């Protein structure tokens, strides 16, 4: 009996029962990473276990270890709390400005944030290298780069633009929520921010699309069907079937767009805008309806 990838055992195409070892050995092909093109050789061009280690893998692992050490030190020492749900890792005060001093408190927040940034960029570059070794596209790096740009907006661009550097988030479990709540209520009705609304729309659409795609694929896995049943099912309900290649494109685009608009709204709310209720005071004054009402229906 031939075992299928789903799990079926169907008695008996050009397929055959092949162990994963043959596939793993066949596709190694060392010597095509990004660092090899630049320097002419990759210093770390091997595998340690199941992982591939490259030039940026070492940088990422160093950043990870250093960041975790600094995070634990600020929270076990200098706070004396001993539990992780009550830790509160703060940046330097707003009065200090854009400068950093080891003597003053908030230095290890700097160390952890820098190490985390280095680790994130190293992970992105490692993903690019692994994609380039397999002759694939560069789509996953684009999505992860959207996420990393979302991080850089919150921790680098906004504090520099506002110029005091106390405007970055504390790295504490259950405590970054305090920062989110206070920032959101400082610019009251953060719902009324247009880009926040677009981001929420994209998030909800992404979840709905994921559920629909999972249901559709799972509904035909282990049945004797002609591969066109799903198209008829999706045209009978809603009167449209996107196809096999369109659903993944839509998923990738929606996922990236949500985070992009979210980082745009956070940065814009930081500097160029002060109140999101006053932002809509232009609407009722446009010269198409500013003179049509009376009493409570005026304006």
């Amino acid at each position: 009996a031939l075992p299928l990838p789903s799990g079926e055992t169907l008695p008996a195409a050009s397929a055959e029962v092949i162990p994963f070892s043959i596939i793993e050995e066949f596709y190694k092909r060392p010597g095509k990473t990004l660092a090899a093109r630049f320097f002419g050789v990759d210093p770390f061009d091997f595998w340690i276990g199941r992982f591939y280690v490259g030039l940026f893998g070492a940088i990422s692992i160093i950043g990870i270890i250093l960041g975790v050490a600094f995070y634990l030190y600020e929270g076990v020492v200098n706070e004396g709390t001993l539990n992780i749900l009550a830790m509160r890792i703060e940046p330097p005060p707003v009065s200090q400005g854009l400068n950093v001093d080891p003597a003053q408190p908030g230095f290890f927040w700097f160390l952890t944030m820098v190490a985390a940034t280095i680790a994130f960029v190293g992970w992105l570059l490692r993903q690019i290298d692994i994609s380039l070794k397999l002759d694939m596209g560069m789509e996953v790096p684009i999505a992860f780069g959207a996420v990393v740009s979302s991080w850089i907006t919150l921790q680098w661009l906004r504090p520099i633009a506002m110029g005091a550097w106390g405007h970055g988030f504390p790295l504490g479990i259950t405590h970054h929520l305090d920062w989110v709540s206070n920032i959101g209520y400082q610019y009251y009705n953060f719902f009324y921010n247009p880009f926040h609304a677009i981001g929420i729309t994209l998030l909800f659409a992404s979840t709905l699309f994921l559920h629909m795609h999972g249901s559709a694929v799972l509904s035909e896995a282990k049945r004797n069907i002609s591969d066109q049943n799903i198209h008829v099912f999706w045209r009978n309900i809603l009167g449209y079937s996107i196809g096999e290649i369109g659903i993944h494109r839509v998923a990738f685009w929606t996922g990236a767009a949500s985070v992009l608009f979210s980082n745009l709204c956070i940065f814009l709310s930081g500097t160029f805008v002060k109140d999101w209720n006053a932002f809509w005071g232009f609407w009722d004054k446009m010269p198409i309806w500013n003179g049509v009402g009376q009493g409570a229906l005026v304006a």
Binding site: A146, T153, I160, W253, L268
Partner: protein
């Protein structure tokens, strides 16, 4: 507020928007 630095950071954010736009343009240009 220093309006030069803020505009520079805004330009960086709009640059960060670019790769998805490039992917959309590539998908449109191919598949004629």
């Amino acid at each position: 507020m220093n309006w030069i630095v803020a505009t520079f950071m805004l330009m960086f954010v709009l640059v960060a928007f670019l790769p998805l736009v490039v992917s959309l343009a590539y998908t449109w240009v191919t598949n004629p």
